[PDB]
Amino acid sequence: MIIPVRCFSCGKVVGDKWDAYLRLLEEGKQEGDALDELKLKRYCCRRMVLTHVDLIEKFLRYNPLE
Amino acid sequence: IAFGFADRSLPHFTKDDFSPESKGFVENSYLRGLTPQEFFFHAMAGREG
């Protein structure tokens, strides 16, 4: 859950791309070209976004105590 | 590796299948990967050890 702020293998600012990545996904688009559009050049940065697993949406769909 | 079933080591082999593939001789290397029958035979050997 939640993409890392900094790239584990490299250290590039990557966090502010997730919403953009979903935007790219919506138009039935291939993955790799979209990642390249996201300036993901190092394949470490590339699979970090490619293979990230966000999980808060199920956690947030739980009705909280407040 | 003997014929575990009735006169056969696997249902994919036949009765009295004296040929190597039906009795546990590996025909592959670890590079190539192993067929399911002989994979089960290597499982035999590993569990034996």
Binding site: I3, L50, T51 | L10, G33, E48
Partner: protein, 1157 residues
Amino acid sequence: DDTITTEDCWTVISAFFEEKGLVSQQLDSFDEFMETSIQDLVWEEPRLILDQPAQHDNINKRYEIRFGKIYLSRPTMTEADGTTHAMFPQEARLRNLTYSSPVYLDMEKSMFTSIDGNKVHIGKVPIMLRSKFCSLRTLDEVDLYKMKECPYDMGGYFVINGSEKVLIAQERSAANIVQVFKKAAPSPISHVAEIRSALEKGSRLISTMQIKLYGREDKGTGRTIKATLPYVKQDIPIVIVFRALGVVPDGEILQHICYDENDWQMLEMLKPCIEEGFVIQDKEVALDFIGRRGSAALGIRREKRIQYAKDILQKELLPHITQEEGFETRKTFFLGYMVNRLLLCALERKDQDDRDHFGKKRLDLAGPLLANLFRILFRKLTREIYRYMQRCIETDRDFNLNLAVKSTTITSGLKYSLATGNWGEQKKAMSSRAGVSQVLNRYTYSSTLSHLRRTNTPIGRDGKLAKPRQLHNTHWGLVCPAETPEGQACGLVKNLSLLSGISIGSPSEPIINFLEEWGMEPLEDYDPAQHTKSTRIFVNGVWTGIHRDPSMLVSTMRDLRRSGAISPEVSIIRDIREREFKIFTDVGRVYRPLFIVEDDESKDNKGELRITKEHIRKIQQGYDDDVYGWSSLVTSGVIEYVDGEEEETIMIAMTPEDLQTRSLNDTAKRIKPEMSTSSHHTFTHCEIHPSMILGVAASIIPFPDHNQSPRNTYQSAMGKQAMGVFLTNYNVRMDTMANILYYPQKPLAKTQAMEYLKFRELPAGQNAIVAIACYSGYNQEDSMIMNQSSIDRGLFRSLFFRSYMDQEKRFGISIVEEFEKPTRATTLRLKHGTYEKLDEDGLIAPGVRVSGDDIIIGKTTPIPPYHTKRDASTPLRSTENGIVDQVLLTTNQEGLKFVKVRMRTTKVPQIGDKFASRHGQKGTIGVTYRHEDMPFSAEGIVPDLIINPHAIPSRMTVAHLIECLLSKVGSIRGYEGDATPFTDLTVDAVSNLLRDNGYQSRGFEVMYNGHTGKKLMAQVFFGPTYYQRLRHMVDDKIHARARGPVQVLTRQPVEGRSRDGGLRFGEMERDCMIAHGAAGFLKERLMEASDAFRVHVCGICGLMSVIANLKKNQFECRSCKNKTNIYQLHIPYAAKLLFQELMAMNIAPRLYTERSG
């Protein structure tokens, strides 16, 4: 219609799980429990009669109670203040309650004084959390969104007192089968024909019989046969019991035994049996013979002796065949043929009976296990009505009838069996099975799923053997061949395969009708001459007919099971060679769905699949083009269930390639059967996928078929204990341990069954960068080198949660302890920890930075008598730090406040932390190095972790190399790579694509020494891999003890890292020290580091019998009046204990400080 590919097979498996799933067996088992099993167990004896024969003139005042229908209620927990509410599982967990519902019955009364409705509460039944009567069954997901349950948490267990207990299914031998074994030669018995003849329905033991063959060859006289019938005190000859069972002439005994009359050897071998039974020439003398040894009482006389022998020949002898009258002729024929099989096995004309083939074994699920336990508990329920309606029948009072029904009868047996683990009664603690029910693990999500699909063989190490632990060919495709426990339980405790389903239990009578539909020849008709080669037909193991034209009937049964009129799981087996046939519908026989290759050679589909792309498209719709579910494929005759006993009689195609019988030089492909002499192969079936021989855990490994099987087993074992994310609502659960990864990552290498496992959604591990070399020298010996930058960014950072449970207690009725802040005045015997964190109610606030030596839950307990209160608090664990995640305040069941405090900590890797790959590659961290010191690539790229090359020569993980290569390729191309076993992928093509990726085909790349930037001479194989964090850390085992608490009895250092345990010095360590000449060292290890007391013993008697007082300086040996000849002894306290029990056993071990000479 067209050829069947792999993705079509995947779609078939999608239908399979969308209808069945993987809990279907458990669900249907427990539903069968409370839909057929419970009612039958209730009404298995529906008649309760009492009487008062005397006067009232003369009368039979007949108190007669008739049983009736049961009642099921929806879960309601009934608070202890009359504020009754319908119970929700979340509340049950929060308040430590049992997922149990009340049940009721109609035990109506019928009074019959002769001259000669009512709804009581039976008890409260714990319920499996996804049965049809579960509280949240009809409620939809949004309702579930209001009750806070993890949608991926898939039930299948039981909730008792807030603890989740799962009933482990127990595998046991299928009954009602002949079991001839070779008895030891130095014994009068040669071959033991055994049959556990017990009622098929219920699958419960009624009796068994073992016929033993006496004598040897040219030794031990004739080949006499005398078996010990159940409850007889002597081996009675078989010919004699044949006389007693109706057929007194011996030719009838042979007509029952002899069925190949062309043989003379068996005739001359049964001649001695005729000679010895010749003393018996009629049924009367034979029955008296049996009754004399029948273990009955004395004075029964010949008449009742014969009657009891006849009954025991009738009941408890072949009870699965019959217990009533009329089939004693069937008894004679069945016993004759069973003796014949015994004799043929003795002659070794047939291979001796195998002891592992699952076809003779079943699996008792939660259903029949609970059925048996309920049988026990209810058999001690129906009787306490009698044992109370006798003390009141003499008074003939207006009995309430709601006070004689001790309803907690069936509460406590189930509570003890599910809580302690012993399936029986606490009084009968001995001879009880332990482990059938165990606490559900939620360490990881699979720690539940796989946990819900175990099997166990409860034989015991009574005789070690390898057969219960060794994999067998019959285990192919039916169980996971890599998932096994460690040493003590390795091989045992076995898991299913992926597509398995268990027979929930169908009535056998429909099968009886299906078989009798083909002109069955009765067992009475079975004759040596007439039926010289006819087919003997058996049901569930009971021999129930003969036939001479069996091909038509077996074909019809096969096609009918393809149709669905026969329950699709019912096993049909045709023993062509031994002129036999057998149908099995008993509970516990496990089946796999096989693609139905046309076996009747009448079409091109012979050697092809009945299921075609039409069926695949229909399934892809999810419905039918006028529904097409999984049962649609099963009942359409294109896929059918098969058991192992059926499997050994069928020939199955591995992949869609060898279906049609076939008619170069590639070093990246596998091998099918050669087909050189056997030019033809009519495979009757084909698996949906060979990769489905795997297990739930095995469906995780990338190419598990390219690595050593022992490493595959190690992977299977470590997979359940690998760190990850178990449940979505981990927070609302107050569990002993909870582990959640900061950043779960879907593996770059994936299987296709992965897709079904939803591993993208609950991934265990991260894709981190590894390079192979020997750079630091610290990578040796299972150690890895780590990138510090990734750790700082949080790679494999995680969250741990620990829930402490506390509660107030009732010493009396009003005497209660309270959760309050301990102080120096009201509280005595305080502890050095800081109590300040407590505020008003002995509860710390949520979010405070808790640590050890600090009280988190304060409790004060009364002292038995002004200043009569003791600290009973439970502070945080000494070497544990973190922040309080959550504080739950509730009550218990009745009246005491119950608090659940979960504390949260962040875990970060450190030198020594344990990790493993998906290829058995396990090790700890050896050293961590920062970015600048480790070498970089041409693009200046460093790995996250470094491993030892020495694993490859030794551990030989080719699949790890393939995984790393595919990982590089996927990361560059930006997609999820597939690693499903038994697929057509080739490494050479991947290397070519890597060339296309502008990278070296074999993955090598120049590193530049981090300290110097110099091009390291070799080009380093360097890229991503999917690894997993493991439960074992370094700092949980660091433990030093110079002096701590000592055990209350031994006066020696305690054991256990929890309570400052000492190092238990093994005896081999003593021996090696002795060989090392370590006298003083070992002495002080036993003197100062261990128990050491000084005493004053006598010099006359030489015993410790001396009243001793150092301050008084008086030492009087009351034994010998010795005061001056008293010696001081500084010896271990354990020596004092030894001397003590030696004295206590009236033994006098006279210690002497001198030498008698």
